[PDB]
C-alpha positions as CSV (number, residue, x, y, z in Angstrom):
1,X,16.2,-14.4,-20.6
2,X,13.0,-16.2,-20.2
3,X,9.9,-16.1,-17.7
4,X,10.7,-18.3,-14.7
5,X,7.1,-19.4,-14.4
6,X,5.2,-19.8,-17.9
7,X,1.3,-18.9,-18.4
8,X,-1.1,-21.5,-16.4
9,X,1.8,-22.8,-14.8
10,X,0.4,-23.8,-11.1
11,X,2.3,-23.4,-7.7
12,X,2.0,-25.6,-4.8
13,X,-1.3,-27.2,-6.7
14,X,-3.1,-23.8,-5.4
15,X,-1.7,-20.7,-7.6
16,X,-2.5,-20.5,-11.6
17,X,-0.2,-18.2,-13.3
18,X,-2.3,-16.0,-15.3
19,X,0.0,-13.1,-16.7
20,X,3.7,-11.4,-15.8
21,X,2.8,-7.8,-14.2
22,X,6.0,-7.0,-13.2
23,X,9.8,-8.1,-13.0
24,X,12.9,-7.6,-15.4
25,X,15.7,-7.2,-12.6
26,X,16.3,-9.3,-9.4
27,X,13.0,-11.3,-9.6
28,X,9.6,-11.5,-11.4
29,X,6.0,-10.6,-10.0
30,X,3.0,-12.7,-11.8
31,X,-1.0,-12.3,-11.4
32,X,-2.1,-15.3,-10.4
33,X,-5.4,-17.6,-9.2
34,X,-5.9,-18.6,-6.1
35,X,-7.7,-22.3,-7.1
36,X,-8.9,-22.7,-3.4
37,X,-10.3,-18.8,-2.5
38,X,-10.9,-18.3,-6.1
39,X,-9.7,-14.7,-5.9
40,X,-6.5,-13.3,-8.0
41,X,-3.2,-12.7,-6.2
42,X,0.3,-11.4,-6.5
43,X,2.8,-14.1,-7.0
44,X,6.3,-12.8,-6.4
45,X,9.3,-15.4,-7.8
46,X,13.2,-15.3,-7.3
47,X,15.2,-17.8,-9.3
48,X,16.8,-20.2,-6.5
49,X,20.2,-19.8,-8.3
50,X,20.2,-16.0,-8.2
51,X,23.1,-14.7,-6.2
52,X,21.5,-11.7,-4.5
53,X,18.3,-12.7,-2.5
54,X,15.7,-10.2,-1.4
55,X,12.6,-12.2,-1.6
56,X,13.7,-13.8,2.0
57,X,13.5,-10.2,4.1
58,X,10.2,-9.0,1.5
59,X,8.7,-12.0,3.2
60,X,10.4,-11.0,6.7
61,X,9.4,-7.3,6.6
62,X,6.1,-8.1,4.8
63,X,5.2,-10.8,8.0
64,X,6.5,-8.1,10.7
65,X,3.8,-5.4,9.1
66,X,0.4,-8.1,9.1
67,X,-2.3,-6.6,11.0
68,X,-1.1,-2.7,9.8
69,X,-3.1,-0.9,7.3
70,X,-1.3,0.0,3.8
71,X,0.4,-3.3,3.9
72,X,-0.8,-6.2,1.2
73,X,-1.8,-9.5,3.3
74,X,0.7,-12.1,3.2
75,X,-1.3,-15.3,1.7
76,X,2.0,-17.9,1.1
77,X,5.5,-18.1,0.4
78,X,7.8,-21.3,-0.5
79,X,11.3,-22.8,-1.7
80,X,12.0,-25.4,-4.1
81,X,14.9,-26.6,-6.8
82,X,14.3,-23.8,-9.4
83,X,12.7,-20.7,-8.1
84,X,11.3,-19.3,-4.6
85,X,7.9,-17.2,-4.3
86,X,5.6,-15.2,-2.0
87,X,1.9,-14.6,-2.8
88,X,0.3,-11.4,-1.8
89,X,-2.8,-9.9,-1.8
90,X,-3.2,-8.1,-5.3
91,X,-3.8,-4.1,-5.4
92,X,-5.0,-1.9,-8.1
93,X,-3.1,1.2,-10.0
94,X,0.0,3.0,-8.6
95,X,0.4,6.5,-8.0
96,X,2.7,6.6,-10.9
97,X,0.2,5.4,-13.4
98,X,-2.5,7.5,-11.6
99,X,-0.6,10.6,-12.1
100,X,0.1,10.1,-15.7
101,X,-3.4,9.4,-16.2
102,X,-4.3,13.1,-15.2
103,X,-4.3,16.0,-17.5
104,X,-1.5,18.3,-16.6
105,X,0.4,15.3,-14.7
106,X,-0.8,16.8,-11.4
107,X,-3.1,16.0,-8.6
108,X,-5.6,18.6,-7.0
109,X,-4.4,19.2,-3.2
110,X,-7.3,17.4,-2.1
111,X,-5.9,14.2,-3.3
112,X,-2.1,15.1,-2.9
113,X,-2.7,15.6,0.9
114,X,-5.0,12.8,1.5
115,X,-2.3,10.7,-0.1
116,X,0.5,12.1,1.9
117,X,-1.3,11.1,5.3
118,X,-1.5,7.2,4.0
119,X,2.0,7.1,2.7
120,X,3.1,8.8,6.2
121,X,1.1,6.2,8.2
122,X,2.8,3.4,6.0
123,X,6.3,5.0,6.3
124,X,6.1,5.2,10.4
125,X,4.6,1.5,10.1
126,X,8.0,0.2,8.4
127,X,10.2,2.3,10.6
128,X,8.1,0.8,13.9
129,X,9.4,-2.6,13.0
130,X,13.1,-1.7,12.5
131,X,13.3,-1.1,8.6
132,X,14.0,1.4,6.0
133,X,12.0,1.1,2.9
134,X,14.8,3.2,0.6
135,X,12.8,2.9,-2.5
136,X,10.0,5.4,-1.7
137,X,8.9,6.6,-5.1
138,X,5.1,6.6,-6.2
139,X,5.5,3.4,-8.5
140,X,6.1,1.7,-5.3
141,X,2.0,2.6,-3.9
142,X,-0.9,1.2,-5.5
143,X,-4.8,2.0,-4.3
144,X,-6.9,-1.3,-3.5
145,X,-9.1,-3.1,-6.1
146,X,-11.9,-4.0,-3.8
147,X,-15.2,-2.2,-2.3
148,X,-13.2,-2.3,1.1
149,X,-10.2,-0.9,0.0
150,X,-10.2,1.3,-3.5
151,X,-9.7,4.5,-1.4
152,X,-6.8,2.8,0.8
153,X,-3.0,3.4,-0.4
154,X,-0.4,0.5,-0.2
155,X,3.4,0.1,0.3
156,X,4.4,-2.1,-2.3
157,X,8.1,-3.5,-2.8
158,X,10.5,-3.9,0.3
159,X,13.1,-5.5,-1.8
160,X,15.7,-2.5,-1.0
161,X,14.3,-2.7,2.7
162,X,17.2,-2.5,5.4
163,X,16.7,-3.1,9.2
164,X,18.1,0.1,11.1
165,X,17.3,-1.4,14.5
166,X,18.3,-4.8,16.5
167,X,15.8,-7.1,19.0
168,X,16.7,-4.6,21.4
169,X,15.2,-1.6,19.3
170,X,19.1,0.1,19.2
171,X,19.9,1.8,16.3
172,X,22.4,0.0,14.0
173,X,26.0,2.0,13.6
174,X,25.9,3.2,10.0
175,X,28.8,2.6,7.3
176,X,30.6,5.6,6.1
177,X,29.9,4.3,2.9
178,X,26.9,2.6,1.7
179,X,26.4,2.7,-2.1
180,X,22.6,3.7,-3.3
181,X,21.2,1.2,-5.7
182,X,17.7,3.0,-6.3
183,X,15.7,5.5,-8.6
184,X,17.4,8.8,-7.9
185,X,14.6,11.4,-8.9
186,X,13.2,10.9,-5.1
187,X,16.6,10.0,-3.4
188,X,17.6,12.6,-0.6
189,X,21.0,14.3,-0.8
190,X,22.3,11.6,1.8
191,X,21.5,8.8,-0.5
192,X,23.1,10.8,-3.5
193,X,26.3,11.1,-1.6
194,X,26.3,7.4,-0.7
195,X,25.8,8.0,3.2
196,X,24.0,5.5,5.4
197,X,20.1,6.2,5.0
198,X,17.9,6.8,7.7
199,X,14.4,7.6,8.1
200,X,14.7,10.8,7.4
201,X,15.7,10.0,3.8
202,X,12.6,8.1,3.5
203,X,10.5,11.5,4.3
204,X,12.6,13.3,1.9
205,X,11.6,10.8,-1.0
206,X,8.0,11.6,0.7
207,X,8.7,15.5,0.6
208,X,9.8,15.4,-3.2
209,X,6.6,12.9,-4.2
210,X,4.0,15.6,-2.5
211,X,5.6,18.5,-4.6
212,X,5.6,16.4,-8.0
213,X,1.7,15.6,-7.2
214,X,0.9,19.3,-6.7
215,X,3.6,21.0,-8.8
216,X,3.3,18.1,-12.0
217,X,7.3,18.4,-12.1
218,X,10.5,18.4,-10.3
219,X,13.3,20.7,-11.4
220,X,15.6,17.5,-11.9
221,X,12.9,15.5,-14.3
222,X,14.8,15.3,-17.6
223,X,18.1,14.5,-16.0
224,X,19.2,10.7,-16.4
225,X,22.8,11.0,-14.9
226,X,22.8,10.2,-11.2
227,X,25.7,12.3,-10.3
228,X,24.2,15.5,-12.1
229,X,20.9,15.0,-10.1
230,X,22.4,15.3,-6.6
231,X,24.5,18.3,-7.5
232,X,21.6,20.3,-8.9
233,X,19.3,18.8,-5.1
234,X,22.7,19.5,-3.1
235,X,22.8,23.4,-4.2
236,X,18.5,23.9,-5.0
237,X,16.9,26.2,-2.6
238,X,14.2,23.9,-1.7
239,X,11.8,26.6,-0.4
240,X,11.2,27.3,-4.2
241,X,9.6,23.8,-4.4
242,X,7.0,25.3,-1.7
243,X,6.3,28.5,-3.7
244,X,2.8,27.0,-4.9
245,X,2.3,24.7,-2.1
246,X,0.6,25.1,1.5
247,X,2.8,27.4,4.1
248,X,2.5,24.5,6.6
249,X,5.0,22.4,4.4
250,X,7.9,25.0,5.4
251,X,7.5,23.1,8.5
252,X,8.1,19.5,7.3
253,X,10.9,20.8,5.3
254,X,13.0,22.7,8.1
255,X,11.9,19.4,10.6
256,X,13.9,16.7,7.9
257,X,16.8,19.0,7.3
258,X,17.4,19.2,10.9
259,X,17.6,15.1,11.4
260,X,20.5,13.0,11.0
261,X,21.1,9.1,10.8
262,X,20.3,8.3,14.9
263,X,17.4,11.1,15.4
264,X,13.9,9.7,15.3
265,X,11.5,11.9,13.2
266,X,8.6,13.6,14.6
267,X,5.8,12.0,12.8
268,X,3.4,13.9,14.4
269,X,4.6,17.2,13.2
270,X,4.9,16.3,9.4
271,X,1.5,14.4,9.8
272,X,0.1,18.0,11.4
273,X,0.9,19.9,8.3
274,X,-1.4,17.8,6.0
275,X,-4.3,17.6,8.4
276,X,-4.0,21.7,9.3
277,X,-3.5,22.1,5.4
278,X,-6.8,20.4,4.4
279,X,-8.4,21.7,7.6
280,X,-7.8,25.2,6.3
281,X,-9.1,24.4,2.5
282,X,-12.1,22.6,3.5
283,X,-11.0,19.0,2.5
284,X,-12.4,16.0,4.2
285,X,-11.8,12.5,4.0
286,X,-15.2,11.7,2.3
287,X,-14.2,13.8,-0.9
288,X,-13.6,11.6,-4.0
289,X,-10.1,11.3,-5.7
290,X,-9.2,12.9,-9.2
291,X,-9.4,9.6,-11.1
292,X,-12.6,8.8,-9.5
293,X,-16.2,10.6,-11.0
């Protein structure tokens, strides 16, 4: 109905809103200027009157992940009468926009495999601190916007994230039904069947992304009905998806198909598939990205 923060509004006498860059549902994201440090920042705001409060745990997750790569630096957070906010490091173009920018809407295996390695490190990272992301998709990963960071992929929105552990590190018992409230294009069949998601379901999203990066489409690309996408995925011969993909990816598929809610994944196996695939084709970490020149 209206922006929570209007343009040139200033938060806690430090962060001057510039423009709206995201939001619409369950909160808003702003580009803002840090009047102290003089750099532009990501300012996420939730209405304090809002019923469902995700920004609390976003901060929680974002705080446990400080000191790991592929995670935005935590600047500030605060509560007040009209809104809650978090202040973050600003990142660059997300992978969804970067894939649409390419002709054929595809990435060379050079880029696809190197993105896979970074995305997998950060999926292991969030798992390492007892949280599922549960919204793994290209628009939730961005390249840095600095000389130090322009070749680093960052994991972005922790608003659908869930704690699968406790302090002791025991796995939390699943719900018989947990309703899937997310983008269905990269959803695993478990998510589609409204079962408690696991670490595997984040790797299912990783799998489906890397296919769409290399092939340029998924068989269910057109369909906008949630039920139909799930029934197509439930029956589809996933081997087909690998027809034009490195043969090592068959290892990736067979492993994730074996896992259930409780089984910790082999993150090193999946990482090997990418390393080995690059190894065979003489791809190296110093090689340019399709959007560079």
